[PDB]
Design an enzyme around this catalytic site. Structure first.
Site, PDB file in Angstrom:
ATOM      1  N   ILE A 106       0.813  -1.245  -0.167  1.00 33.56           N
ATOM      2  CA  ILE A 106       0.011   0.082   0.013  1.00 33.56           C
ATOM      3  C   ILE A 106       0.991   1.234   0.035  1.00 33.56           C
ATOM      4  CG2 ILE A 106      -1.780  -1.339   1.059  1.00 33.56           C
ATOM      5  CD1 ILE A 106      -1.254   0.612   3.640  1.00 33.56           C
ATOM      6  N   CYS A 107       0.231   2.393  -0.321  1.00 39.47           N
ATOM      7  CA  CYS A 107       1.039   3.560  -0.571  1.00 39.47           C
ATOM      8  C   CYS A 107       0.269   4.459   0.610  1.00 39.47           C
ATOM      9  CB  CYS A 107       0.892   4.266  -2.000  1.00 39.47           C
ATOM     10  SG  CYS A 107       1.640   5.899  -2.009  1.00 39.47           S
TER      11      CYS A 107
END
Ligand SMILES: [Zn+2]
Ligand SMILES: [Zn+2]
Lengths: 94, 82, 148, 108, 99, 85, 99, 83, 109, 93
Positions: free
Chosen positions: C85-86
């Site tokens: 994820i970012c």
DNA sequence: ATCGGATGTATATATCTGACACGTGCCTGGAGACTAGGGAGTAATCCCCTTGGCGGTTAAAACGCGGGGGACAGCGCGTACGTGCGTTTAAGCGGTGCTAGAGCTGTCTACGACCAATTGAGCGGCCTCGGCACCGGGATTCTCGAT
DNA sequence: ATCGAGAATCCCGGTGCCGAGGCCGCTCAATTGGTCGTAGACAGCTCTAGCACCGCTTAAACGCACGTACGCGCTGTCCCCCGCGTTTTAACCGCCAAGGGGATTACTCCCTAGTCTCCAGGCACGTGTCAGATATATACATCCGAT
């Protein structure tokens, strides 16, 4: 129009808005900060060049810059800056 | 042409610098010696400034030339770029 | 040691007051590795979507952020195919005061509202920014076959 | 760290890593430049900048102002044991001098 | 009968005043004329940017202030409070610019 | 007034607070947490993220990190904790 | 009956003698041991080339000779012929090595 | 094989000889300790940089070139041992 | 010139021109090096070396010796004016010091 | 083994030009080599900085001339410039 | 002002020892010819900033005067440093022994330069409102002469 | 030890203005992806010189006694900076006018990097000899007490 001239004003302001969120800065103070950043950049990157030339190398690595920081900065500033740079490199690689 | 402009550095203008330097009492012969040393320093800086200007094939002495000369003599100046 | 005690306190807090539409726990014998299930938020096009993810705790906790990774394949500009994820809270602005509940709720909010300023994948972020019907269709059709 | 994002954020810095890398490459310093040198150098520069700026802000707050001026920079630099040593042969324009009167000159 | 301050109590007040401020103490037109006259020997028909004169003035004032700071210490070391032309010479010799 | 036990704790340990330090932002945390975050973390404030690098360099040299005024107040009320800690 | 020089002539004779020759004036083994002790304080288990110790001795002796010249001038400035520690302190302060 | 209080090997006659070369005619009795302190500070400052230079090259012997480079960096160039 | 002799002989110098050119090129100074820079640099270096050697030889002859030793170089450099300023911050190994005694310290008449 | 270059033979040739009778020891040769290297580095660094200031990318003879003028004192600088110009003019034709 | 001790320094002679100067082999770096490309020289255009000028007002420089404090010279005391002598210490010289580590060579892998597309970071220009400078009145605190 | 008066400085409130900071448009440099030649990392080997030890000489360090001359304090004199008032000089500021030279862009040519081939100049090594350092014996310059 005038040609593009680069500076560290944006990054210096970004750093300033961290330590003191409610403090501005004058134009002359920003110019002095820019000159200081340029001078320290030249000092470190010129010491590293000779440090690499002494050992007959062609690359400037983080080791040369670390030893230049060790040689230039005073007793405790050198320790803190070396720690900061080591943390930055470790966070960058991984 | 200009002549004898060193007398524009008057006695009060030297007393103010001495007071900023922290001097409480000044003898009367200080002023001429101060003028002489100031003239020597100005000549030393302006020679390198003019050399920098002449190398770049220009007729105006920019602030960059003064900054470079001051850094060359070991008097790094912050505020006027560079 | 200190990290083990911190994880014990985290589990005590989770057991005392269960969190909101999330549930995390140690899948294996070791408490360092965790698995967490997150349900689709109501105010999102991910209704009825369960997502499994893995938690890796660094040896020096909480001073180093834990690593989260989606096990399932979910369509979103801030998540790759490998399940990463970012999130800036995850690694850029992590602080020892934050807990796993905070980052899990931040992930849920990111599901509710994505991040278009610094997307991890540019193409699907551009698809999101351009239109919504196609994005909604593909998100629904992939979450109806991969989430559950 | 994971790729596919700006280099300044991977290292968690604020100073640019691309600009520092370009300046190191084109500065006639060495034939080749390592990929980790700009990160370390930018980190050092940012640390020094924050170091000076914090003291400058403290000095400005001591004078009831909310704006840093070169006098505050001079005051911050000259009151620190290490910063004064680092910037020892450097003149700050419009910075003045520290208040210091010798004890001999004081009235008795 | 009229008020008069004893000698030395007004010099200290000016010391306290001038160390608190930052402005330049030398007048600007005489210094500009001096700079141009000095520079006319090296090259003729020169022109000066407005910033160059100010940079020269700042550097010269800082140098003179430092020289007077050293001269005061030289004078005090000799067990007197008056600075004399034989203190500037000693300071310049020790610093390295006289030899 | 005298603070209660629940409202005098460090956010990192989550246990009883010992040897408090008060940052320029007035956030309080026990000294071992600060010592640990200096080595590995970003040297900022764990709570509000305000840089205290000059503060750390100033106070570690003089060993004045501890908030002595609050340390005695916390110590006198709860001395039986120190034996187990 | 015995002959002895007045205090001062032998000092001038030694001054003339030692300003003419160029050999080192500090015994080599004690200086080598001091250098090794300081280096061991910095980094343990170090080895020294002989030329390194020789260069260190030359640099230290030249520095001390210059410092003593400046100290003598400082002492003379105060209407004296004896050099005292305050002269050394003033010379180091003006030169900028102690500020 | 540790070493202690070796600065007493810089004897008073050696300091007198250095002063005589410098041109000093009469010496006070407190000069020797001050000179010892100044010499120790200078030696520490030079040796620190020499050790840093030899550490960067992954060596264990300090060559004359490291000392020459340290002296040149400090602003005291030395002719006779290389460079 | 004839473009046939060696570069140093073509320019009338004794210091090498090819070595100076190589040192300029491989020294990390500029991306390019002109054709006439090594000649000028070699000429300047040779002139300075010749000046110092001449003064040192004069000092050695005055000392009744036929070999320059570091003492003679120290004498030649310090006794000059421009050369002393060029090498103001330079220490010569085994050089000694110039002889002088302050007039105050001399015996009274 | 290892080949170490030096300016020893050129210094000896110049000495024999100046003083045909006097010789030279070994420490004096080490000192002269150090001096030549130091002056080379000074002039080259100043010339490189001068070329960088004007946004150039080459080191011609005028950069070296200005560096010599900046470094060497008055009479020394004038004579050095004279010798350098003479050598360049003799070499170019 | 020397008068003659008495000490130290300078001068001339023999000798002999290692460093200096030169001769030899060779091999690695410098010279010679050629090609291609981009960096710098030259010419023309724009307009910005430097030079020159005039009038006013008023802040700062110049001149003078009374006198108080500080610089400089002279005496005197005593103590700390110089000089010479006998005793004790460890430096300096020589010779032997051993191995840690600097210097060199050979393989080969992983890091960094180069090149093409492409798009978002950062620079340039605009606009606005709040922080700081300025002015006026009052309160506070050093300062000095007189008791 | 004190009380009071002239005087300089700090606090506080109100008004105005100009520049610090944020927004919008856009051009270009930094990012991504792939390719390839080579720097340096690692391993093995050699052999140099840095460290350690031992015995003898005598040179320099050390402790001590005597004495004298130089540092430090005190007193006195006088003259030269300092503080304050008044008058003269020109710095500072606002305005207008002009043109010199800095800054930029288009075009072209010639000068330097890169490559390959070849040979000779300088470097490592070895050897003869004389420049100078050392020991010995006179000869003069200088210091010192005192007629
Ligand atoms: Zn805690
Ligand atoms: Zn905080």
């Amino acid at each position: 129009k005038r040609s593009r001239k680069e500076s560290y004003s944006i990054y210096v302001y970004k750093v300033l808005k961290q330590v003191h969120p409610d403090t501005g800065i004058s134009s002359k103070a920003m110019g002095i900060m820019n000159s200081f950043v340029n001078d320290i950049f030249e000092r470190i990157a010129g010491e590293a060049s000779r440090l690499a030339h002494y050992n007959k190398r062609s690359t400037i690595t983080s080791r040369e810059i670390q030893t230049a920081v060790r040689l230039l900065l005073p007793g405790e500033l050198a320790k803190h800056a070396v720690s900061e740079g080591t943390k930055a490199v470790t966070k960058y690689t991984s | 042409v200009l002549r004898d402009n060193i007398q524009g550095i008057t006695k009060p203008a030297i007393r103010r610098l001495a007071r900023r330097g922290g001097v409480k009492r000044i003898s009367g012969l200080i002023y001429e010696e101060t003028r002489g040393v100031l003239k020597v320093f100005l000549e030393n800086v302006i020679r390198d400034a003019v050399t920098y200007t002449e190398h770049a094939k220009r007729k105006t002495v920019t602030a960059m030339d003064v900054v470079y000369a001051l850094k060359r003599q070991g008097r790094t100046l912050y505020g006027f770029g560079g | 040691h200190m990290a083990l005690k911190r994880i014990n306190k985290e589990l005590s807090d989770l057991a005392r007051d269960p969190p909101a539409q999330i549930s995390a726990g140690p899948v294996g014998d070791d408490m360092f590795h965790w698995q967490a299930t997150i349900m689709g938020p109501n105010d999102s096009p991910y209704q009825g979507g369960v997502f499994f993810l893995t938690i890796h705790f660094p040896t020096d906790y909480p001073f180093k952020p834990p690593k989260v990774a989606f096990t399932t394949r979910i369509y979103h500009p801030n998540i790759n195919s490998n399940g990463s994820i970012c999130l800036d809270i995850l690694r850029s602005q992590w602080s020892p005061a934050l807990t796993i509940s905070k980052v899990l709720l931040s992930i849920a909010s990111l599901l509710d509202d994505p991040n278009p300023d610094d997307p991890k994948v540019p193409e699907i972020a551009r698809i999101y920014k351009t239109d919504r019907d196609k994005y909604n269709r593909i998100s629904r059709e992939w979450t109806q076959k991969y989430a559950m | 760290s994971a790729k596919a994002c700006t280099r300044s954020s991977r290292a968690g810095l604020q100073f640019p890593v691309g600009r520092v890398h370009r300046l190191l490459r084109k500065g006639n310093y060495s034939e080749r430049v390592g990929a980790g040198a700009p990160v370390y150098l930018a980190a050092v520069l940012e640390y020094l900048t924050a170091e000076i700026l914090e003291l400058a802000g403290n000095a400005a707050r001591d004078n009831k102002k909310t704006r840093i001026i070169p006098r505050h920079l001079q005051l911050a630099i000259r009151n620190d044991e290490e910063l004064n040593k680092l910037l020892g042969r450097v003149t700050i324009a419009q910075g003045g001098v520290l208040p210091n009167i010798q004890a001999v000159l004081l009235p008795k | 009968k009229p008020h008069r301050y004893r000698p030395g109590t007004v010099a200290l007040r000016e010391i306290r005043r001038y160390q608190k401020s930052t402005e330049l103490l030398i007048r600007k037109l005489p210094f500009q004329r001096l700079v141009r006259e000095i520079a006319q020997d090296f090259k003729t028909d020169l022109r000066f940017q407005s910033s160059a004169v100010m940079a020269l003035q700042e550097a010269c004032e800082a140098y003179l202030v430092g020289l007077f700071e050293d001269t005061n210490l030289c004078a005090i070391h000799a067990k007197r409070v008056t600075i004399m032309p034989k203190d500037i010479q000693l300071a310049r010799r020790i610093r390295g610019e006289r030899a | 007034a005298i603070p209660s036990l629940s409202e005098c704790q460090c956010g990192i340990c989550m246990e009883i607070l010992v040897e408090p330090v008060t940052l320029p932002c007035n956030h309080t945390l026990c000294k071992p947490c600060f010592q640990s975050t200096v080595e590995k973390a970003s040297l900022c404030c764990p709570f509000c993220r305000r840089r205290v690098s000059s503060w750390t360099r100033y106070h570690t040299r003089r060993n004045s990190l501890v908030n002595v005024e609050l340390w005695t107040i916390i110590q006198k009320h709860y001395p039986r904790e120190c034996k187990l800690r």
